Ligand binder design. Structure first.
Ligand SMILES: *[C@@H]1O[C@H](CO)[C@@H](O[C@@H]2O[C@H](CO)[C@@H](O[C@@H]3O[C@H](CO[C@H]4O[C@H](CO)[C@@H](O)[C@H](O)[C@@H]4O)[C@@H](O)[C@H](O[C@H]4O[C@H](CO)[C@@H](O)[C@H](O)[C@@H]4O[C@H]4O[C@H](CO)[C@@H](O)[C@H](O)[C@@H]4O)[C@@H]3O)[C@H](O)[C@H]2NC(C)=O)[C@H](O)[C@H]1NC(C)=O
Ligand SMILES: *[C@@H]1O[C@H](CO)[C@@H](O[C@@H]2O[C@H](CO)[C@@H](O[C@@H]3O[C@H](CO[C@H]4O[C@H](CO)[C@@H](O)[C@H](O)[C@@H]4O)[C@@H](O)[C@H](O[C@H]4O[C@H](CO)[C@@H](O)[C@H](O)[C@@H]4O)[C@@H]3O)[C@H](O)[C@H]2NC(C)=O)[C@H](O)[C@H]1NC(C)=O
Ligand SMILES: *[C@@H]1O[C@H](CO)[C@@H](O)[C@H](O)[C@H]1NC(C)=O
Length: 338
């Protein structure tokens, strides 16, 4: 009858108990120091469910766990209305260049300068690098691009050679705002200021930093008219073509559980969201399920809704094939010595 949520960390736990109070014991709590550990608890059946990102889903899918509800995020386009009925699409990981540099295509990237949001980031790293392994067949992506700015790698690396830090020699290649070329924005600036030949960002990154949308000096005089997406065809389409010229769709996070206790979770959550969701009965009142004393506890903070999925998809399908191609190959290069 009860659903046991698994909290990764002492603060998720703190929230999970409030949830349990308000829910009048309909949702109780397990907890673990790691996510992989919470996954396990779901397998062992010591905990029922928890929300996971593209990558953890895979992990858990492979261990035979199942997506249940996606986590839809507030957006520019999303109707925002009756979102519970289906998932929204989620970021389009795109490769971006300037129109100038004609030679550049998804095929001719070897030994170019690269700009990454940060290491281990989905659109900035996992997706693009994952699909380059698919090309090269090899795992030596550390040495694919001549030099790069990938915040979070070793400052000594060539993967950090392009990163600028605070421009006073400090905080080179760190995954913070302190690193000049960090983030979607920073990777895009990395491109704009001709430090790098390709930037791996998302659709909007381009738009929201062109044609007046950004007041930053490097951004003032930037026209979408001057940048191209790279498609997997090796075709260079305009910036407006993200929809059919992306690398992959960043997966929406997803609530996950065993099939044997899948539809129960589903049924129990939709109610808890009605009580505690963005505009549920008791949200401004007793407990908001998508607000966090810290940030992103149990659920990302900017969660519109948990969404009924489209039938009964396997993780392979829920994640999209492009993404798995990637995470797979980075999971093969990962765990290389067996
Ligand atoms: C790739 O990335 C880009 C960048 O994010 C993205 O473009 C954005 O698309 C959205 C949706 O098409 C645009 O949103 C609309 O913007 C207007 C206001 O526009 C101005 O102000 C913004 C900044 O605040 C500027 O960026 C923009 O250039 C304009 O100057 C809003 O009024 C719209 O509101 C609607 O939001 C929802 C949209 O589905 C709905 O809730 C509803 O339609 C809202 O509006 C209206 O509906 C009522 C019924 O018709 C009507 O009666 C009401 O009066 C009301 O008008 C909406 O937010 C956004 O501006 C774009 N941003 C940029 C920078 O271009 C692409 O969509 C994305 N595409 C791909 C390829 O993935
Ligand atoms: C934790 O999970 C439990 C179990 O799912 C939730 O319990 C439900 O709580 C609601 C509200 O307290 C219950 O709903 C109401 O029950 C009334 C009487 O109960 C009988 O009839 C309903 C069906 O009508 C049966 O489901 C139930 O077993 C009983 O036989 C009903 O009269 C109400 O329905 C009528 O009036 C409303 C309002 O006008 C109409 O909208 C309806 O169409 C209908 O005419 C209503 O169903 C519900 O039955 C409970 N389930 C149980 C115990 O079986 C907890 O809410 C949840 N807790 C939290 C905080 O998350
Ligand atoms: C690379 O990616 C595409 C799309 O995932 C796939 O169809 C193709 O066969 C892959 N190539 C190799 C050699 O795996």
């Amino acid at each position: 009858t009860r659903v046991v949520w698994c909290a990764v960390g002492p603060e998720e736990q703190k929230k999970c108990q409030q949830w349990s109070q308000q829910s009048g014991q309909n949702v109780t709590c397990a907890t673990a120091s790691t996510t992989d550990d919470c996954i396990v608890l779901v397998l062992k059946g010591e905990a029922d469910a928890l929300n996971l990102d593209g990558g953890y889903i895979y992990t858990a899918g492979k261990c035979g766990l199942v997506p249940v509800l996606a986590e839809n995020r507030k957006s520019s386009k999303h109707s925002s209305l009756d979102c519970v009925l289906r998932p929204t699409e989620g970021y389009l990981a795109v490769a971006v260049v300037k129109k100038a540099n004609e030679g550049l295509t998804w095929n001719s990237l070897k030994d170019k300068k690269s700009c990454h949001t940060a290491v281990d980031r989905t659109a900035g790293w996992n997706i693009p690098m994952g699909l380059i392994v698919n090309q090269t067949g090899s795992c030596a992506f550390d040495e694919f691009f001549s030099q790069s700015c990938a915040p979070g790698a070793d400052p000594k690396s060539r993967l950090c050679a392009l990163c600028a830090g605070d421009d006073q020699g400090l905080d080179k290649c760190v995954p913070n705002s302190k690193e000049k070329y960090y983030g979607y924005t920073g990777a895009f600036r990395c491109l704009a200021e001709d430090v790098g030949d390709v930037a791996f960002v998302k659709n909007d990154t381009v738009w929201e930093n062109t044609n007046g949308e950004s007041t930053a000096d490097w951004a003032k005089n930037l026209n979408r008219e001057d940048f191209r997406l790279l498609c997997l065809d090796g075709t260079r389409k305009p910036v407006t073509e993200a929809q059919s010229c992306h690398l992959a769709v960043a997966p929406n996070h997803a609530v996950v559980s065993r099939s044997d206790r899948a539809a129960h979770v589903k049924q129990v959550l939709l109610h808890q969201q009605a009580l505690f969701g963005k505009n549920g009965k008791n949200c401004p009142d007793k407990f908001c399920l998508f607000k966090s004393e810290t940030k992103n506890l149990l659920f990302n903070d900017n969660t519109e809704c948990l969404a009924k999925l489209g039938g009964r998809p396997t993780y392979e399908e829920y994640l999209g094939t492009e993404y798995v191609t990637a995470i797979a190959n980075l999971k093969k290069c990962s765990t290389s010595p067996l």
